[PDB]
Amino acid sequence: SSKLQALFAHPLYNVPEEPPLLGAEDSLLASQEALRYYRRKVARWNRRHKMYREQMNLDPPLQLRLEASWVQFHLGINRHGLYSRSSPVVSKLLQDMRHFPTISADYSQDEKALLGACDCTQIVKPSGVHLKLVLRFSDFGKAMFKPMRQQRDEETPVDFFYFIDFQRHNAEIAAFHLDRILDFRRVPPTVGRIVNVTKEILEVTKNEILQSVFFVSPASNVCFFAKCPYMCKTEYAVCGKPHLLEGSLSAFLPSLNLAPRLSVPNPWIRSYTLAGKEEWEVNPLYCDTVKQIYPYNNSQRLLNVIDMAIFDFLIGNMDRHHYEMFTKFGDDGFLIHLDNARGFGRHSHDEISILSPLSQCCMIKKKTLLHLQLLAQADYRLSDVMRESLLEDQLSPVLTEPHLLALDRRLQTILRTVEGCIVAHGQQSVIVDGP
Amino acid sequence: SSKLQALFAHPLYNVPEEPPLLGAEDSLLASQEALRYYRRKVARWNRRHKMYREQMDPPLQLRLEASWVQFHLGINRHGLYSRSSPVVSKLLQDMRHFPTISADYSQDEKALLGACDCTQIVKSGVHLKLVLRFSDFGKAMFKPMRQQRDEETPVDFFYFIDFQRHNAEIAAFHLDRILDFRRVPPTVGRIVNVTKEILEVTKNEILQSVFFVSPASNVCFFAKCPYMCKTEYAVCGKPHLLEGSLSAFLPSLNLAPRLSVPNPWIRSYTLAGKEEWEVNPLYCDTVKQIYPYNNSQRLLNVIDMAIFDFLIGNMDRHHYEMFTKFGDDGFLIHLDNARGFGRHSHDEISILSPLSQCCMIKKKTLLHLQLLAQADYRLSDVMRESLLEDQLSPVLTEPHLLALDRRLQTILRTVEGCIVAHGQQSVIVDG
Numbered sequence: 056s057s058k059l060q061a062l063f064a065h066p067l068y069n070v071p072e073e074p075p076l077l078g079a080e081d082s083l084l085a086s087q088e089a090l091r092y093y094r095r096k097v098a099r100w101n102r103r104h105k106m107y108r109e110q111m112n113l114d115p116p117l118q119l120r121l122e123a124s125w126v127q128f129h130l131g132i133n134r135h136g137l138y139s140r141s142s143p144v145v146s147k148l149l150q151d152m153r154h155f156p157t158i159s160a161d162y163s164q165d166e167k168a169l170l171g172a173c174d175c176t177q178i179v180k181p182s183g184v185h186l187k188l189v190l191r192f193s194d195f196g197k198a199m200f201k202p203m204r205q206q207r208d209e210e211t212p213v214d215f216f217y218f219i220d221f222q223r224h225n226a227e228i229a230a231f232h233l234d235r236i237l238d239f240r241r242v243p244p245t246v247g248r249i250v251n252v253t254k255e256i257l258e259v260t261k262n263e264i265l266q267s268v269f270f271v272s273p274a275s276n277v278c279f280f281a282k283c284p285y286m287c288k289t290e291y292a293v294c295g296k297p298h299l300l301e302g303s304l305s306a307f308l309p310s311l312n313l314a315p316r317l318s319v320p321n322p323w324i325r326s327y328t329l330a331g332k333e334e335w336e337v338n339p340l341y342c343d344t345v346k347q348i349y350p351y352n353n354s355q356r357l358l359n360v361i362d363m364a365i366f367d368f369l370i371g372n373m374d375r376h377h378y379e380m381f382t383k384f385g386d387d388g389f390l391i392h393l394d395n396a397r398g399f400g401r402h403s404h405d406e407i408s409i410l411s412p413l414s415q416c417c418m419i420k421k422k423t424l425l426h427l428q429l430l431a432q433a434d435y436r437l438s439d440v441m442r443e444s445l446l447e448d449q450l451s452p453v454l455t456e457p458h459l460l461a462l463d464r465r466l467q468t469i470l471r472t473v474e475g476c477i478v479a480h481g482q483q484s485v486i487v488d489g490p
Numbered sequence: 491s492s493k494l495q496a497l498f499a500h501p502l503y504n505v506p507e508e509p510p511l512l513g514a515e516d517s518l519l520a521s522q523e524a525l526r527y528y529r530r531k532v533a534r535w536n537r538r539h540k541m542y543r544e545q546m547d548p549p550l551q552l553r554l555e556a557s558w559v560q561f562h563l564g565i566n567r568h569g570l571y572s573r574s575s576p577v578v579s580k581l582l583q584d585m586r587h588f589p590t591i592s593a594d595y596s597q598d599e600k601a602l603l604g605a606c607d608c609t610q611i612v613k614s615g616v617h618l619k620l621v622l623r624f625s626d627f628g629k630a631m632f633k634p635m636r637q638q639r640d641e642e643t644p645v646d647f648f649y650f651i652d653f654q655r656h657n658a659e660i661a662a663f664h665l666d667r668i669l670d671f672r673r674v675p676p677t678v679g680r681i682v683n684v685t686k687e688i689l690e691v692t693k694n695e696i697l698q699s700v701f702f703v704s705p706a707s708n709v710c711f712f713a714k715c716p717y718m719c720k721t722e723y724a725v726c727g728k729p730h731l732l733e734g735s736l737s738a739f740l741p742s743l744n745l746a747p748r749l750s751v752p753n754p755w756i757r758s759y760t761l762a763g764k765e766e767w768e769v770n771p772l773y774c775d776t777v778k779q780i781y782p783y784n785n786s787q788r789l790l791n792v793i794d795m796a797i798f799d800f801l802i803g804n805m806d807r808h809h810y811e812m813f814t815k816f817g818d819d820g821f822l823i824h825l826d827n828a829r830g831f832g833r834h835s836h837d838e839i840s841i842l843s844p845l846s847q848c849c850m851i852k853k854k855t856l857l858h859l860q861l862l863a864q865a866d867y868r869l870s871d872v873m874r875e876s877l878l879e880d881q882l883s884p885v886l887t888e889p890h891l892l893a894l895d896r897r898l899q900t901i902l903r904t905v906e907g908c909i910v911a912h913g914q915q916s917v918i919v920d921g
């Protein structure tokens with residue numbers, strides 16, 4: 056039969072989560088306050104669209120429809136995660152980002168600043184994906200489009216080979232599918248899409264700078280480039296073949312005006328060579344100190360970081376410098392796992408230093424451990440349910456077989472690490488229950 | 491006598507460097523082209539200053555004998571400045587004493603205004619730094635001392651806070667000069683009247699509006715977006731004076747373009763047991779076959795940079811910068827050393843990975859390290875002596891100074907390990 060279907064039909068994936076949702080105070084957005092904010096944005100967008108049409112030389116207006124996928128997605132964000140388990144709203148949102156036509160395109164706000172005044176210090180930073188764009192669909196929803204990395208390192212002399220995000224777009228897609236399978240529900244829905252850069256980007260953008268950077272390749276391909284990255288001799292161009300370009304689309308979170316977010320540094324982003332001969336991943340003194348440092352003094356926050364370390368270890372992401380949280384949900388709120396483009400880069404190496412929070416603190420959520428133990432059994436094998444889940448995406452296969460099988464190998468390392476913690480402290484100390 | 495004086499009088503610190511400079515192609519700037527560019531900027535600044543003052547004095551003239559002008563014209567293929575340079579000595583004094591005439595935000599921080607997004611704010615970033623311009627038209631990067639405790643910055647993680655930030659920029663330059671790397675810009679400490687020398691001289695209305703008087707009757711200025719993100723957001727005089735670090739500006743990118751290059755050893759990896767990462771050569775054997783590390787000079791320069799970073803315990807050298815004119819094999823600029831001198835009781839040997847994996851080192855670099863390990867030229871003694879010249883003396887406490895001796899011994903013991911495995915001929919490269 057189907058292992059993915061058996062997984063979500065399993066009793067474990069149908070246990071109600073505690074404490075139950077109390078409606079208002081547990082939802083991220085207030086429906087009436089958020090809807091009138093979106094209605095003002097749609098009226099704003101229609102005014103710009105009517106005036107822009109007059110400035111050039113030339114359809115019915117757009118209406119904010121409450122039943123849109125992204126609207127229900129935003130209103131569905133609650134204290135338990137970004138989305139619900141076995142959610143038909145997420146399924147509809149994935150299809151909508153995959154098929155809906157685009158109506159506008161622009162740069163991301165963080166890259167509109169780096170249009171200068173070209174300085175290679177703020178351009179060659181890691182984890183930064185230049186040439187990415189924000190697309191707006193016909194239902195007014197927005198997604199972050201990260202195009203596939205195409206240029207080899209000979210075309211980018213400054214880039215170091217083993218740091219290039221070759222798997223960049225595949226990593227965003229597969230990280231969401233693993234998030235759903237693990238039932239963390241902490242990364243935004245993400246799909247692959249083959250995009251006509253001419254029709255769905257160049258012909259819909261109102262940004263004159265983005266219009267001017269499009270050009271025709273000597274091989275008769277349609278391309279757009281970033282000028283400042285080109286001068287810094289890093290990645291600067293992507294091209295259709297001759298029009299179609301493959302990439303990843305990630306659904307936008309609610310506006311920071313409606314839901315502010317904080318960025319918090321990851322205390323385990325770096326490992327340290329301790330004075331011999333105790334190993335870093337096994338020594339608990341660091342976490343013993345972090346446990347006494349706000350906000351890691353409360354149980355939920357440290358357990359959430361341990362969840363994030365397990366997720367990062369599974370995808371081999373060494374670049375989680377910071378994690379983000381919603382302000383409304385306070386310190387005990389869940390962590391948002393954004394920008395996973397640095398994952399799934401090395402299928403033949405497992406960086407156990409990512410697991411350091413688990414191996415040092417020696418505690419784990421009961422829910423998290425049961426899901427990992429279930430995904431290690433043959434009937435629910437993690438590589439099988441992942442491969443099956445990823446067949447839904449337009450860019451199937453998202454992950455090759457070596458990456459899928461590495462998920463099973465890294466899962467065994469996580470469970471074998473849990474065994475080590477239990478030997479040293481007992482199940483009562485390691486396996487923490489939820490309020 | 492004086493160990494610092496004995497160091498620079500030693501024969502080693504007076505050997506002429508090969509190959510000798512051939513004048514034109516070895517200097518960074520073309521004198522006549524750069525001087526007319528600076529003269530246009532001074533005329534521009536006088537034009538901006540004449541209109542601004544009318545909306546509410548004799549003009550400024552670009553003087554060739556100014557310290558920073560000779561500093562810029564002195565940059566050549568061998569480093570940012572010359573050994574035992576009286577121009578550098580004058581520049582350190584000028585940045586310490588000259589009055590300011592203008593103040594503004596750094597260019598990279600004018601972008602984050604803002605439009606507040608905490609992702610681009612909590613990035614090694616000093617958001618309260620300012621660029622000051624002196625009466626001789628020279629510019630310096632002012633990084634104020636970190637004052638706010640972590641209770642006032644709920645998002646900041648304690649062991650990541652750059653408490654030693656301003657002292658680290660100063661001490662990193664003094665160590666750069668003592669090592670004779672000559673690769674970081676001259677840097678001084680200064681106790682700055684934030685009212686007289688910043689608020690009353692800036693033409694940026696936003697910077698004017700962020701100044702306020704503390705309830706404790708201190709003069710402060712703050713950053714709005716960092717405050718909302720619950721990170722470091724304010725520094726204060728007591729009630730006017732605030733100490734910080736001043737780093738001399740490099741020439742304009744219009745005159746001398748620079749590239750940023752990722753450090754291939756910024757991260758360490760857990761190899762399959764039980765071979766250690768810093769000792770296993772397979773990684774550098776691969777990097778040696780990857781441009782531009784296939785040529786000798788570039789890899790040796792990175793190894794120099796790793797030695798420097800290990801001495802100061804800087805784990806945050808994600809990128810290094812180079813001048814475009816000098817092409818490959820050019821020297822590396824060691825900028826923004828604010829993350830150094832943070833842990834005096836811990837030695838992160840993974841920083842030394844380029845040396846311990848590649849097992850090669852410059853002959854010049856090794857001889858300077860071997861000399862600085864001897865009692866008569868002890869690195870901690872010459873550093874402590876050198877740092878007494880700064881207004882914020884001692885700049886470094888005793889644990890940080892003594893850690894320099896311990897890390898120097900670790901570097902030398904690593905070289906011995908390389909020589910045992912490959913012999914002196916393979917490890918010690920000549921120029």
Ligand SMILES: Nc1ncnc2c1ncn2[C@@H]1O[C@H](COP(=O)(O)OP(=O)(O)OP(=O)(O)O)[C@@H](O)[C@H]1O
Pocket residue numbers: 163164165199243305306307308309310311312393394
């Ligand atoms: N799913 C996501 N993946 C990656 N980054 C995201 C995602 N959602 C939001 N962001 C980040 O948040 C920014 C959008 O923040 P903002 O609050 O401006 O949203 P907005 O809807 O554009 O705001 P406004 O309501 O003013 O138009 C993006 O530039 C991006 O960097």
Ligand SMILES: Nc1ncnc2c1ncn2[C@@H]1O[C@H](COP(=O)(O)OP(=O)(O)OP(=O)(O)O)[C@@H](O)[C@H]1O
Pocket residue numbers: 596597598631675737738739740741742743744825826
């Ligand atoms: N000593 C230094 N330490 C650290 N960073 C520096 C130093 N000198 C220069 N920089 C960096 O290099 C950048 C150079 O900027 P820029 O090219 O605008 O210089 P400029 O002289 O202001 O140029 P312009 O001729 O346009 O005025 C600065 O923004 C600064 O961040």
Ligand SMILES: *[C@@H]1O[C@H](CO)[C@@H](O[C@@H]2O[C@H](CO)[C@@H](O)[C@H](O)[C@H]2NC(C)=O)[C@H](O)[C@H]1NC(C)=O
Pocket residue numbers: 251253254297298299
């Ligand atoms: C992708 O989009 C482009 C642009 O709309 C399509 O190209 C055009 O349609 C036909 C086919 O060449 C021509 O008569 C038009 O003149 C083209 N327009 C432009 C602006 O070039 C293209 O067909 C789409 N599909 C693919 C697979 O490329």
Ligand SMILES: *[C@@H]1O[C@H](CO)[C@@H](O[C@@H]2O[C@H](CO)[C@@H](O)[C@H](O)[C@H]2NC(C)=O)[C@H](O)[C@H]1NC(C)=O
Pocket residue numbers: 683685686730731
């Ligand atoms: C720092 O600078 C301020 C401003 O120049 C000095 O304050 C002034 O002191 C004079 C008398 O010496 C008064 O006439 C002004 O009204 C003061 N201005 C303000 C804003 O208070 C201050 O004395 C300086 N502090 C030093 C040099 O330590």
Ligand SMILES: *[C@@H]1O[C@H](CO)[C@@H](O)[C@H](O)[C@H]1NC(C)=O
Pocket residue numbers: 349352353354
């Ligand atoms: C965690 O520590 C903070 C310290 O400010 C305290 O306010 C909070 O009540 C503590 N919570 C728990 C669950 O220990």
Ligand SMILES: *[C@@H]1O[C@H](CO)[C@@H](O)[C@H](O)[C@H]1NC(C)=O
Pocket residue numbers: 781784785786
């Ligand atoms: C290193 O490789 C580049 C390009 O592959 C080449 O131009 C250069 O000459 C090589 N280095 C040496 C020392 O030959």
